[PDB]
Every structure is written in C-alpha cells, then in structure tokens.
Structure 1
C-alpha cells in the first residue's frame, strides 16, 4: 500500500499540524508500539502527546488493542472514509448559500426577502417602508458575498480538483486494490 502511504502523506500535510502528522506517519508503518515507547520515540510531553493521541483517536484516526497496557495503531479504513467526509464538506460548500432576492433597511440593518416585499410596500410613497422603523430599503449584501469572494473559493475548489484528480486516480487504484 505504498500509494496509500503517500496518499496518507498528502493527508497529514493538508490536515493537522506537524506533530500530528509525525505521529500519524510513524503509525502508518503498522506500528503497535507501547505508549511509553511511543513517548520515548517521539520525545513529546506525556500528557500532551496523550492529548494529541486522544484528539486523533476521537475523530477516528486511531485504533487500539488492550494488551492493562494500552497500544495504538492506525485505523483500518484507508483514509477514503476521511476523504469522503471532506468531499461532503466541499460538496456542502459548492452549494449556493446566497439568495438572489434581497432588500435591507439601512437603519436596523435587518434583512428581508422577496417574500416580505409584497407586505413591506407603502402606497403613499410608491416604494418600501420597513416594519418597525419605516425607511427605504435597497439591496442587502449582509453576511453575504458582494463580489468574487465565495466564487473565488468555488474557483479555488475548481483549482483543487485537478491537483486532486491524480489522488482520485490514487483512489481508483486503491479501489481496484480491494481485490488484493
């Protein structure tokens, strides 16, 4: 699983810090080392390394063997589980959160939609008057992208996708590798 080893080397760099990356890396070689031994090998602080180990174990990066001696080893799922979850994270993002229908009152900075426009009308002025502090409303752009920026992240996501294509192929090879 040399490909998976490298795909993992990708995952450590992208994800957490180098301490975590270092701990994951030693484990990738099918480590079953004693925690005290893993402490001496790593030379971290015992409590804090354990904090690293608990942070990694809970998100589900780690598996154990109760030997009452405690032993740690990389969970046997081969990242894909992590990647699938991450893809959903990206897949959620990708979806538009900005409404194409949007007035706001400058005074109260509240937000309103097309749905409220048929009620926020006032015929004596021929335009819109707010509910609790009647003032003219114009556009919104509140807690929302004005220009480019969510889109730049979507373009960023697009930029990510080719450099992830090879990794998707790494996955393809891994997925054929599930005969072996």
Structure 2
C-alpha cells in the first residue's frame, strides 16, 4: 500500500488544493482517524470540515466505519478514471474533420462551403462570388470555427496528453503490480 501512498502524494500535489491537501495529508496514516481528532488537529471549521469530508466521501476516498467513532480509508478510483476521461476529451474535441476552407463573404459575413461558392464561382473573374452580393469570398475564419477551437485545443490537449500519459504509466506500474 506504500506505492498507493506514493501515488497519493503525487495526486494531492497534482490535483487537490491546500484546504483539501492538508486534510488529505492526515489521511496518509491509515491506522486510526476519528472525526473529533481530525477536527481538533486541523482546527478547520466543523461545517467546513464536514464539507471536505463529504467531498472526500463523494470521491469514495474514505470508507467510514461505525466504531460513534469513525475511521477513514482510501476508495478513490478517479485517478485512473479521470485519466481515462482525459483520454476521452483528447480524442473528441482535439480532432478536426477537415480543412473546411469554405468561402466566406467579408461584407455580409455569410458562410459558404467550397461547394457553396463553386456554384457561385464566376467564370469571368476566375474567383468565387458571394450569393446575394457580388463581393468576393474569403477563408472560413471566424465562421464555423470548429478548427479555430480545435487548433488551440489540439496543442493544449497534446501538452496535457504527455503529462497525463506519464501519470498513466505510473498508475499502470502500480495497478499491474497489485495484479
């Protein structure tokens, strides 16, 4: 369980905030953890401590035992679950279906496909003319900006992907070990 303790030192570092992390530090020792002791030791607000505990309960990071005295032990499957969710976002938002360079008319900010301006394509000018106004078309640009969001995300998602892939290899080294 020492490895899980170590993975825990990383995740608290990697994710939880000081208020959470200070409480999570106490969770380090899985020998005995009462509610009165943890309250007095942390000197956190009782309502607020109950909120954090309730939050940790939501993680299933703590298994309450009715000794009434209580005990709190690890039940969080979110680290691997969250890494899988990261892989799922990496795979859907980041991908761009096509170049999608539809003509767009700068005067009326109307959006066209390469197909839309093809019917418009004006053979006397060797270029593409907008529909109701003969002003020349432009790149898709702001219109239909799936790529504009994806291009920024594409790169943001790849950085997050190297960091999370390192975290996932550490998790597999722990998860494979315990079979």
Q: Secondary structure at the match of 1:88?
A: helix
Distance 1:65 1:128 in 2: 73
CA RMSD of superposed structures (Å): 4.4
Deviation at 1:93, TM superposition (A): 4.6
- Compare 138-147 and 87-96 and name the one that shifted more: 138-147
Alpha-carbon distance between aligned partners in 2 of 1:51 and 1:16, rounded to the nearest angstrom: 14
Deviates more, 1:92-101 or 1:167-176: 92-101
Q: Tell whether the 8 Å contact from 2:94 to 2:151 is kept in structure 1 after alignment.
A: no
Q: How big is the shift at 1:152?
A: 7.0
TM-score between the two structures when normalised by the length of structure 2: 0.64
Deviations along 1:106-141, one digit per CA (max 9) or x if unpaired, are 456565544644567688987656678885431133
After superposition, give the CA deviation of every residue in 1:24-83 in whole Å (9 maximum; x if it has no partner): 232243265222322212211122222223333335444434556665432154832333
Q: Is the 8 Å Cα contact of residues 8 and 79 (structure 1) preserved in structure 2? A: no
Moved more, 32-41 or 85-94: 85-94
Indicate conservation of the 8 Å contact 2:93/2:150, yes or no: no
Does the 8 Å contact 1:32/1:73 carry over to 2? no
Corresponding residue number in structure 2 for 1:77: 77
Does 2:107 correspond to 1:107?
A: yes
Give unpaired runs (5+ residues) of structure 1: none
Check 1:163–1:118 CA distance in 2 against 1; reply closer, same or farther (3 A cut). closer
| Pair 134,51 (structure 1): closer, same or farther in 2 beyond 3 Å | farther
Unaligned stretches of 5+ residues in structure 2: none
Q: How does 1:121-132 map onto structure 2 within 5 Å?
A: none
What is the aligned residue count? 179
Contact 1:104 1:139 in 2 (8 A): yes
CA deviations over 1:140-159 (Å, ceiling 9, x no partner): 33288899996576556555
C-alpha change, 1:6 and 1:107, in structure 2 (3 Å) is farther
* Residues 104 and 112 in structure 1, CA contact (< 8 A), matched pair in contact too: yes
- Largest Rg, 1 or 2: 2
- Separation in 1 of the partners of 2:166 and 2:137? 49
Name whichever structure is richer in strand by fraction. 1
When structure 1 is superposed on structure 2, of 99-108 and 157-166 the one drifting more is: 157-166
Q: Quick one: structure 1 residues 131 and 176, their matched pair in 2 at CA, closer, same or farther if it must change by over 3 Å?
A: same
